[PDB]
Amino acid sequence: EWTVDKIASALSVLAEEVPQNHSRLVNFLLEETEKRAPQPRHLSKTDPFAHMKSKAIDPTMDVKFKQHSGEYGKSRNSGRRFQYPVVCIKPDREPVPPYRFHHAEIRKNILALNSRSQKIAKRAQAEYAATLAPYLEPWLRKLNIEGCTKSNLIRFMASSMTPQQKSNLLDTYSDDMAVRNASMFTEAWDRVFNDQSLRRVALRDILMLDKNVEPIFEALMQKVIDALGSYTTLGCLICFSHDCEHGEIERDNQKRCFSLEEIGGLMPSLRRKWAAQIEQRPPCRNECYRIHGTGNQQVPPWSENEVGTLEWMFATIGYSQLRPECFVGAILGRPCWDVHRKLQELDLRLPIPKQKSLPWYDRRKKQLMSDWADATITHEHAVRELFAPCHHDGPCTAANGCPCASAGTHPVLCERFCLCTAEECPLKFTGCACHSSGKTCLQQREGRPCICVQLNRECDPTLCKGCGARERADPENAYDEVLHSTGCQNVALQRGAAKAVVLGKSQLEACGYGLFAAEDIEEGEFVIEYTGELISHDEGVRREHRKVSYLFTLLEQEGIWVDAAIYGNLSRYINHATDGNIMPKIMYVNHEWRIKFTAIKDIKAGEELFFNYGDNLTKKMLPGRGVPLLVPKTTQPLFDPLSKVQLLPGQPLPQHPIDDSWLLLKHRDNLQDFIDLRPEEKEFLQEWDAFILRRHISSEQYLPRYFLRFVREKADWLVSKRSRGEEFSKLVATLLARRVLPERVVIEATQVLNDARGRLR
Amino acid sequence: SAEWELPRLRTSFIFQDDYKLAEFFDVKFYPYSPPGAPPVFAATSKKHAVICRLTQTTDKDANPCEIIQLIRDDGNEANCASCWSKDPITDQPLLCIAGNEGNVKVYNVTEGKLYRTLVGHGGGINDLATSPANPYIIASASDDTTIRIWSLAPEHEKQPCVCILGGEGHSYDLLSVAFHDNGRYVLSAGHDQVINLWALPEFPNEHMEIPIVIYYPHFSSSEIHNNLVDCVAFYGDLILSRACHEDTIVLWRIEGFSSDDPIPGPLDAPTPTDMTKQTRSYFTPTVSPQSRPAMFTRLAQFHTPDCGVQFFMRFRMYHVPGKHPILAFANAKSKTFFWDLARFGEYARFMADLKEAQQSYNGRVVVVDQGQISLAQAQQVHGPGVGVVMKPAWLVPKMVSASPDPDSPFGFSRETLQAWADMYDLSNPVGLIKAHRSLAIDGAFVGRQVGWSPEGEWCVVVGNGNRALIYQRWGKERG
Ligand SMILES: Nc1ncnc2c1ncn2[C@@H]1O[C@H](CSCC[C@H](N)C(=O)O)[C@@H](O)[C@H]1O
Ligand SMILES: [Zn+2]
Ligand SMILES: [Zn+2]
Ligand SMILES: [Zn+2]
Ligand SMILES: [Zn+2]
Ligand SMILES: [Zn+2]
Ligand SMILES: [Zn+2]
Ligand SMILES: [Zn+2]
Ligand SMILES: [Zn+2]
């Protein structure tokens, strides 16, 4: 009945629709625009220029006029020259110092990704594929050729893309094509639409962009591992967010997150909690199993996801002293005895080598000794390469291939995310011995030194007890002057809490901007942090090509840099001097490397801030730096960072809180662009991250408080949908496996969702 | 009756050389005069602002142009940008002027004094535009990469910067800023080859300590053109944009964009999450066969031949109620082009009627001009066998069939039809619309800007050598 010639003949007749429709569309869009022309507004009552007569004369300037007439051209006379008085107006203001881009403030360093004849052809072809794509199905119905359906044409195409991708397509599509007229149609489509000379398309190019093609490119524990997969893969060990500023960006913009899958996934961490629980040797208000046993009535039939919830909660709560019955109950909305019976039916079942102490470090007395600075690189950040923390069964030795011990020229102390414990491992960091009725962790008066100060690290809110870092590294106590008068003193970055500073024109000849003190700063006080985009050496090179540079070397050997070109803080304006009044230092801050500025002299309000940029500037191979408030009185003009309004002394100092929603949104969209995640997954991950990124968590010490704020705030939202509570329990399981969530917090989360559901009922 | 009348060269003037390369970079007519008031315009050279008034005359030998003011920027900068504003107290005309040192000088043109200076930009300003919704709102596009929204209202006197369109919108110098008639949407473009659509928030009637910072455009693309974009404008909700080395003004549209829909918030904007993608949009429609729907559509291409490698060359549409839409543009080889957009649809209705009559009457079609006699009268002359189609009088001769031979009584030649399709056919998005009127100039002239009088009877083109060409339609000259 059909042949290539006849389909090709038919397609040429149908293709005439395309220029017909385009003309109807364009004309329609133009007619609509004319009819909808704007009516002129804000017209004056009187002609404002009415009294102004010609300024001509037979400080002045000349104008020669010519008059024309006719179809072609045409000068009438030769022209007529005239003199006109000139009104000289001089501007009453100097422009502000120059810059490029809008300089936006960031609370902490953010992660940046890496940044012609073919371009034109591809674009011409893409635009053409876009216009023809909506005509394929209408044309296929009009033609009504047996077996010529879009699905069969895609089927034909997959029966030349990568071998794997052809199989993924064939998987969901099958080989049910016969009568494979899909051949004769393809041949005819390419003769008509793929003529070489532009704009052109092969049927495959249209098919490849189709919504159903383009995206298609022991036992209990295996279930639980797969179930918690997204949380272990993306959930951050530092800040607890699923799209954050932690992790590595590969040469292609693929990201290796700093997650549980960095620390060998779920199981090593889980096994260790179970072991810890064994060594360790209030009923719910939803028909508790502790009072109602197992029931005797009949329940609705449980779903796969419902048994899954009971499975991952059972596993992650482990050998506890907190029971899954209550929590799962409050998650699903089924009574407590109901899940206790399901658990009885399912019959679910759960699955120190003496090391020689180091002569350079004592973790018991919490101190360094006998030429420790030649035995380690823990404090030497500039020479430190970043590797994943410990995740091995044996001791932390070179012989056992421990990265902490063997990866560097010298060993490094085992940090909090290393799976080894303080008892089994001599390399483990344990914290501060430091305790005083006054100031400690300096910078130290009373007793032995501060091991943290020594190791170029800020104190750990969890490890540094009687410091009291716990309450001083809490951002909620940032402005508690009374609290900070007492011990530690080594939590500046965690506080932040920067000294009042003001932007202005630098005193340095033709330098542009400078940063000025807006408060008296004493010697050794924390001034400000250097924030920016975290970029690689290579990415930095690309930015240096396409006079003024904002790069700062963070981890030299590792090849990490901080670029404050667009994103950073006022510290980007601090100019160079061989002998400045401040100094940068690279600090280890809860598995983050951050730059802090410390005053090395007493600085007075109005005095400009200066520092030494280092090796890589004569105004007294990547080029970059390295190691009741009022507006002050100054010889230099000062400005608001955002508005650039010139400031005047004595005025209340501009102090604008950072709005990071623009940044929160980019993390929302980054998860929205993941194919590997289900929409039910993205709905929750985005909800949790939007919340947890706002709290800028660096230590697990504050997570239980924010977790509880999240339950209390989102309780109605969580109980209003089956997938939301399901996802939340996945998170809670992952966090319990890590030992990040105290039992009591989960017990309290049970009661929050239980009264939520009760109220909504 | 002469709604189809297109402009003709009436006057031309060379202003004294004031930069020693002297050129008029801008021309803008004052838009707040009462209806009937003589039009007043301002031509901005590198150092001066030449305020003219145009008066219709009966004498072909009389001069319609009178320079009612000539201001000189006595700063150390060179200017290229202008827009008109109003004093929010006295309703007196203000002329904003911007240049290479990054400031906006607002002049009290009637009193010959400086109103104020707007400081804040960190580079030279290439373009200025006033909000059609608020005469006190001004947008400035700069080398610093940002757009600054300023308010001349008394409320904002202390801090005039109401908004900064910054963040991740642009990476190089901006050459164009354009406002939507609703005053809520802004188009920006430049050297980075990106056209961005930004949605402005509502500005409080009170003091703003800091501007509202916008970080992401609601639509962003580098795919409409293949070079630096130096002119961008809205035509309703449609976009008109021009790029260097293309010899065209592209008419195109953002899929899913409508100003009838509620304005989206800042957090509704797409963010660059995938570095590969060169087009991103909040407006993108749900229904399409594509997994990644076409986010824009190329509609037509106005052919502006011989522009060369020149940039900072801008067009202008005359878009007013009860008058035809006229697009005017001047190239780099002494030529001024005009398109009467109202011709497209008339030609379109004509061609459809002609194809229909050709099919229904087996080619027996007689065409009669709309300038007498009547459709019913013509049918009465040729009888039932022949079909009659009415032609617009301006459509002069030389899947629609041409006459079999020259002496055939039905249809037109291929030459006639190809001439009409060159100028009026809109069926090909990558076609080339031939100007409806091309007026030559003497001798060498590169056009920088085009401006239309409120009543559309005057069209002023300004450019190199400090030259101004004045074109007029609906003249009163008694020859
Ligand atoms: N001691 C010095 N000598 C010369 N230039 C200096 C300097 N200290 C800082 N700079 C200038 O400041 C740049 C670093 S960025 C510092 C902020 C800058 N003044 C601004 O206006 O944005 C350098 O690339 C250089 O141009
Ligand atoms: Zn993180
Ligand atoms: Zn219970
Ligand atoms: Zn180890
Ligand atoms: Zn370790
Ligand atoms: Zn260890
Ligand atoms: Zn200490
Ligand atoms: Zn400590
Ligand atoms: Zn401490």
Confirm if A418 and A389 have CB atoms less than 8 A apart: yes
Whether the bond between B113 and the residue before it is cis, its omega within 30 degrees of 0, is no
Residues 6+ apart with CB under 8 A from B214: B163, B164, B165, B166, B167, B169, B198, B199, B200, B201, B266
Amino acid at the residue B353: D
Residue A350 in contact with ligand 1 by CB distance below 6 A? no
Amino acid at the residue A435: H
Q: A757: CA distance to ligand 3 center in Å?
A: 15
Tell which one of A511, A619, A638 to mutate to probe ligand 1, the residue whose CB is within 8 A of the most ligand atoms. Answer: A511
Asked if A65 lies within 8 A of B11 by C-beta distance, the reply is yes
- What are the tokens at B330? 């001047």
Burial zone of A449 (CB within 10 Å; 0-12 exposed, 13-18 middle, 19+ buried): middle
- What are the tokens at A16? 């005439």
CB atoms within 10 A of CB B398: 11
The string over B423-435, giving b where at least 16 C-beta atoms fall within 10 Å of a residue's C-beta and e elsewhere, is bbbbbbbebbbbb
Distance from C-alpha of A434 to C-alpha of A696, rounded to nearest angstrom:
26
Whether the bond between B430 and the residue before it is cis, its omega within 30 degrees of 0, is no
Task: Give the DSSP H or E segment for B381.
Answer: helix B375-382
Confirm if B162 and B211 have CB atoms less than 8 A apart: yes
Residues 6+ apart with CB under 8 A from A732: A313, A316, A327, A741, A746, A749
CA torsion B234-B237-B242-B246 (nearest 10°) is: -170
Distance from C-alpha of A6 to C-alpha of A14, rounded to nearest angstrom:
12
Task: Give the DSSP H or E segment for A117.
Answer: helix A117-132
Burial zone of A576 (CB within 10 Å; 0-12 exposed, 13-18 middle, 19+ buried): middle
Cross-chain CB nearest to A49 (options B110, B116, B209): B110
Phi and psi of A469, rounded to 5°?
Answer: -55, -40
- What are the tokens at A673? 């662009």
Question: Which protein residue has the closest C-alpha to ligand 1 atom 1?
Answer: A576
Residues 6+ apart with CB under 8 A from B414: B402
Residues 6+ apart with CB under 8 A from B30: A48, A49, B39, B40, B41, B42, B84, B93
CA-wise closest residue to B218 among B236, B233, B200: B200
Collapsing DSSP to helix, strand or coil, A305 comes out as: helix
Collapsing DSSP to helix, strand or coil, A514 comes out as: strand
Distance from C-alpha of A452 to C-alpha of A139, rounded to nearest angstrom:
73
Proportion of chain A in helix, strand, coil states, percent, rounded to 5 = 40, 15, 50
β-pairing, A575-576 vs A610-611, is: parallel
Task: Give the DSSP H or E segment for A361.
Answer: strand A361-362
Confirm if B166 and B142 have CB atoms less than 8 A apart: no
Tell which one of A576, A610, A636 to mutate to probe ligand 1, the residue whose CB is within 8 A of the most ligand atoms. Answer: A576
Confirm if A84 and B49 have CB atoms less than 8 A apart: no
According to DSSP, residue B38 is labeled P
Confirm if B102 and B80 have CB atoms less than 8 A apart: no
Confirm if A407 and A387 have CB atoms less than 8 A apart: yes
Number of H helices, E strands in chain B: 3, 32
CB atoms within 10 A of CB B111: 12
> Most distant CA pair in chain B: distance in Å?
79
CA-wise closest residue to B43 among B17, B8, B71, B21: B71
Distance from C-alpha of A667 to C-alpha of A174, rounded to nearest angstrom:
38
Phi and psi of B130, rounded to 5°?
Answer: -100, 145
Q: A700: CA distance to ligand 5 center in Å?
A: 18
Residue A98 CA: nearest ligand 1 atom is: 21
DSSP, residue by residue, A537-606: HHHHHHHHH-----EEEEETTTTEEEE-SSEE-GGGGPEE-TT-SEEEEEEE-SS-EEEEEEESS-B-TT
User: CA distances (Å), A317 to each of A712, A715, B315, in order?
Assistant: 21, 21, 70
CB atoms within 10 A of CB B366: 17
Collapsing DSSP to helix, strand or coil, B98 comes out as: strand
Half-sphere exposure of B465 (CA within 13 A, CB side): 16
- What are the tokens at A526? 């924390």
- Any alpha helices (H) in A280-323, and if so which ranges? 289-292, 304-317
Dihedral sign, Cα of residue A682, residue A688, residue A690, residue A693 = negative
Across A24-177, where does the E strand assignment appear?
A: 60-67, 80-85, 87-89, 104-105, 110-111
What would be the CATH architecture of the domain defined by A501-647? Beta Complex (2.170)
Q: Provide the β-strand partners of residue A88.
A: B72
Half-sphere exposure of B180 (CA within 13 A, CB side): 22
Across B212-361, where does the E strand assignment appear?
A: 212-214, 219-221, 229-235, 238-243, 248-254, 279-281, 296-303, 316-318, 326-330, 335-340
Distance from C-alpha of B396 to C-alpha of B413, rounded to nearest angstrom:
12
Which domains, and CATH codes, for chain B? Answer: 8-343+434-472 (2.130.10.10), 345-424 (no CATH)
Question: Which protein residue has the closest C-alpha to ligand 1 atom 7?
Answer: A576
Distance from C-alpha of B286 to C-alpha of A459, rounded to nearest angstrom:
52
β-pairing, B185-190 vs B195-199, is: antiparallel
Amino acid at the residue A322: L
Distance from CA of A732 to the nearest CA of B (A): 28
**CATH 2.170.270.10 domain locations along chain A:** 501-647
Phi and psi of B352, rounded to 5°?
Answer: -65, -45
